[model samples]
Target: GAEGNTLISVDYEIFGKVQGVFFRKHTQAEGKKLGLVGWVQNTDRGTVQGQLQGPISKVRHMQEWLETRGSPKSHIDKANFNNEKVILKLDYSDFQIVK
Candidate 1:
């Protein structure tokens, strides 16, 4: 998704006890700290769906935070920024709140 001057989307499947434990709060804190705007939702199977957008490097740092520290018990099994979908829009904005 980092190619063609288009937007990039990252999908991650974080493993190890990331449910009902403020994991989403942690993700929000980390993403906000690094200034990456996006959203994260927990799946029915207890997986997290995180999607962020911005400069490639900034997004990378956001992902790094998850890899390094995502709740005390949460652990990232594997991460891939492969799924990307784009639509025409206005100019970009700074990283901010994500629901």
Candidate 2:
């Protein structure tokens, strides 16, 4: 659909100083800027986890950003991406910072 432009959804978790540094806020901002829809939250394991859905290119860009650069004070140790699959449409209307 939509001229074969593919949309994808992916789950990601970032390890290292991600919880106390407003990582979720930064992630939501970045995702919105990239025109992606998703949700981010702090996990019990001192990590940041989220799902991203959008155009494949934008999603890939956001994935790289989450893997490397996060908030100004965030030190991303490693990133894990999983459950990636193509979707026919977006499941969300906007980016969210889940509490």
lDDT of 2: 0.76
lDDT of 2 by residue, 1-99 (tens): 356658887888777677778656666667667798877777676877687788887887877776777566777677889989997888888887878
Q: Which stretches of candidate 1 lie over 4 Å from their true place?
A: 1-7, 84-99
Q: How much does candidate 1 score in TM-score?
A: 0.66
lDDT of 1: 0.60
Write one digit per residue (lDDT tens) for candidate 1, span 14-88: 666766566676665666665655566777786766667655556556666667665566766655555554535
TM-scores, all models, native as reference: 0.66, 0.85
Q: State the displacement of the C-alpha of residue 91, model 1, in Å, after optimal TM-score superposition.
A: 9.3
* Candidate number with greatest TM-score: 2
Question: lDDT of all predictions, in order shown?
Answer: 0.60, 0.76
Candidate 2, run of 10 with poorest lDDT: 23-32
